[PDB]
Amino acid sequence: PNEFMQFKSKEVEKAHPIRLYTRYLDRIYMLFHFEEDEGEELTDEYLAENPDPNFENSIGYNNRKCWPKDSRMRLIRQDVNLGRAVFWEIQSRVPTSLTSIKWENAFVSVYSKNNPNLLFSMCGFEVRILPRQRMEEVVSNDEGVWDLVDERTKQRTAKAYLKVSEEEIKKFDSRIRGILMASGSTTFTKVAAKWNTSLISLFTYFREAIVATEPLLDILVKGETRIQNRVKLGLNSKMPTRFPPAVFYTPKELGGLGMISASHILIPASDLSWSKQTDTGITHFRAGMTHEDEKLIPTIFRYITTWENEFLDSQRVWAEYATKRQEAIQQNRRL
């Protein structure tokens, strides 16, 4: 059998439109690589089937609302039609009595001449893949970007910018809320422990992808301050001077709480009205979780190996292991 998304040949891979596919847990991810002819056919069959005089169907389209206007899927009459057509085709393919494949719960991204970015969510990420050839100027690859490598040439052929999905952010927020409530009985240490757990989950799961999402940053600051106020409220104090970061971020060994800052971060707050249209370079830094007598509390994000690094690294070390295993075999020893 094939390895994950390998093919016995190139020809076989190229034969069909449906170049890749994966059903992560009741959420399919069909990748189609159409030609102009095929696309034309699809649009034809669909459009003829389901006509519309104007563009019209551009509204009621499931775009990626987290990304910015010129970043997410542009609304070309053609490409959009293709997308919708594709979705229709897929719906036709599965019987309705078996399951509900409603357009409303379906994001269709498109890559083309007129659409340079290629979007999706998976495992609660949002991933904007953008190939190097289509980028106007390849800047210093930022953080929260995966440079993807072509297997043949071994060059960084494409980038994949990463946001955290709104859904995941919401889930996180809910978690924080849960922690907060049912804590009148609960003691400060326990509260902080729970919060610590929550934060480490949130990062260690999607590490690198936190850089991008400003809403997540906001939640982290807001949430963290709420937690702090749980302690500060608990002492009926709730006051800045008398809870210097000693009490919170110092560990449980030293009478502290062990709270793990994902807070004293400077929140990148770019021009909100422009940022909606296009991605900006971060220009203005807002002060997130501030304090009087500001001792620069280190974050947690710096002390977790960001995923891309972890994965390249993984590839290296596993390769090394493989090589040494061969050595062991040759030498006839226990490695």
Partner: peptide
């Protein structure tokens, strides 16, 4: 050619039975 090879190639006044209601439940359960 490729689209042939599939298996399938080509108001109510009840608050518990409103389209809005069922939809809402679907949304807020998982």
């Amino acid at each position: 050619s490729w689209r042939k090879g599939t298996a399938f190639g080509r108001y109510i006044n009840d608050m518990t039975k409103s389209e809005y209601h069922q939809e809402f439940l679907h949304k807020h359960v998982r």
